[PDB]
């Protein structure tokens, strides 16, 4: 952008991503489920595609860390800030980091990795925080009961599509 690196949107539709490391909290196979289900949420509303990688540099580098972890924003231990992400662009951009000090769960009994990843990925794609409390892009983790009936707020749809268009 003007001062910090990054671009408003990815200049390509077919993105690649990698789950760098894993959280003990959850079985490796369950992380893959959460992250992938996460990404799908945005593919359904756009022509975007996501290919998983296991080596090399993907666009979206997903990873778990605690306290100091490379970038200029160390995590705050248990509670408060659960995760952060970067906007589209080269290098660290698009990447998403997660606070391991939190209790990551694939169910409604802890901090739902899916819910958070879905939110963070929105940033990797170029979205900002929403004021609409019903919008996924609202930063305050509102944990919903039955996961099966999770739904995107119209607002997020209008948001992401105003960038990448709807599916063809």
């Amino acid at each position: 952008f003007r001062t910090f690196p990054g671009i408003p949107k990815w200049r390509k539709t077919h993105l690649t991503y990698r789950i760098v490391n894993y959280t003990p909290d959850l079985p490796k196979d369950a992380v893959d489920s959460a992250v992938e289900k996460a990404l799908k949420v945005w593919e359904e509303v756009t022509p975007l595609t996501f290919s998983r990688l296991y080596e090399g540099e993907a666009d979206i580098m997903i990873s778990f860390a605690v306290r100091e972890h490379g970038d200029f924003y160390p995590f705050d231990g248990p509670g408060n800030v659960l995760a952060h992400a970067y906007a589209p662009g080269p290098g660290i951009n698009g990447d998403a980091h997660f606070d391991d000090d939190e209790q990551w769960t694939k169910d409604t009994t802890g901090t739902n990795l899916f819910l958070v990843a879905a939110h963070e990925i929105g940033h990797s794609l170029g979205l900002f925080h929403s004021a609409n409390t019903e919008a996924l892009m609202y930063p305050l983790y509102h944990s919903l009961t039955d996961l099966t009936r999770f739904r995107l707020s119209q607002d997020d749809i209008n948001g992401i599509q105003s960038l990448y268009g709807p599916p063809p």
Partner: protein, 126 residues
């Protein structure tokens, strides 16, 4: 940035300073691209006397540069309005984030006010 906000009590215990102040200026990148800062007018200080303050030692509240990475976003119409900012001290500077407990004093229940002024400390160490 996504997060679970703290209960006011946890906001009080884990923070380094629990100041009361008014937002004097719009965000500006100081001596780092990473953080944006707001000039603030500190009125009452409920916590952090190991940093003085009195009425004008803390004149800036820092927060990340961009919302996506947790930067706090303030948008009120009346600048004399007062807020309760519970924040940490990186170096000797007050930092705030998307989750930091920041709410206008006036919106605060009488109970919450009483907690900030006197009762929350009681529950912190244990």
């Amino acid at each position: 940035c996504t997060c679970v906000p703290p209960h006011p009590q946890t906001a009080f215990c884990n923070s380094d300073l629990v100041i009361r102040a008014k937002f004097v200026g719009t965000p500006e990148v100081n001596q780092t691209t990473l953080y944006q800062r707001y000039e603030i007018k500190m009125t009452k200080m409920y916590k952090g006397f190991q940093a003085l303050g009195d009425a004008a030692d803390i004149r800036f509240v820092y927060t990340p540069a961009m919302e996506s990475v947790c930067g706090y976003f303030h948008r009120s119409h009346n600048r004399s309005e007062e807020f309760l900012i519970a924040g940490k001290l990186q170096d000797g500077l007050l930092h705030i984030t998307t989750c930091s407990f920041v709410a206008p004093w006036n919106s605060l229940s009488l109970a919450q006010r009483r907690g900030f002024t006197k009762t929350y400390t009681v529950g912190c160490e244990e």
